[PDB]
Amino acid sequence: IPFHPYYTIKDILGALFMMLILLILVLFSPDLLGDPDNYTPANPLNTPPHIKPE
């Protein structure tokens, strides 16, 4: 089938759903997936008890 009418609209719906999840994160739990210790400025003398990547 041609991409335009079908998958442009389907990809738009998918993008709106993705935007919903993203804005739920940004506006209702901004810090859900982050770490509180990055609200502390970097201290090369003191190391955090836990050093995890993202």
Partner 1 sequence: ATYAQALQSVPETQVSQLDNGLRVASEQSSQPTCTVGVWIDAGSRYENEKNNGAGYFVEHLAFKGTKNRPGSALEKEVESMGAHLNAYSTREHTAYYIKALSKDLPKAVELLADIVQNCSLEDSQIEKERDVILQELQENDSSMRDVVFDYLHATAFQGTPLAQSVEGPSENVRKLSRADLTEYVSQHYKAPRMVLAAAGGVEHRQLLDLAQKHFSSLSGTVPAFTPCRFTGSEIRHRDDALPLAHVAIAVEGPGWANPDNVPLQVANAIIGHYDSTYGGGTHMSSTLASVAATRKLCQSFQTFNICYAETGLLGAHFVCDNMSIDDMMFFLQGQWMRLCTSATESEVVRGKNILRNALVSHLDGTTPVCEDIGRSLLTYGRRIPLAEWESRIAEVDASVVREVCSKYFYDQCPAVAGLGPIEQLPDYNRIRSGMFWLRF
Ligand X SMILES: CCCCCCCCCCCCCCCCCC(=O)OC[C@H](COP(=O)([O-])OCC(O)COP(=O)([O-])OC[C@@H](COC(=O)CCCCCCCCCCCCCCCCC)OC(=O)CCCCCCCCCCCCCCCCC)OC(=O)CCCCCCCCCCCCCCCCC
Ligand Y SMILES: CCCCCCCCCCCCCCCCCC(=O)OC[C@H](COP(=O)(O)OCCN)OC(=O)CCCCCCCCCCCCCCCCC
Q: Which of 2, 49 has the CB closer to partner 1?
A: 2
- Considering only residues 6-25, where is the footprint of partner 1 by CB under 8 A? 6
Smallest distance, ligand Y to C-beta of residue 2, A: 10
Q: Which of 3, 28 has the CB closer to partner 1?
A: 3
DSSP conformation letters of the chain: --HIIIIIHHHHHHHHHHHHHHHHHHHH-TTSSS-GGGGSPP-SSS--S-----
Interface positions with ligand X (CB under 6 A): 4, 8
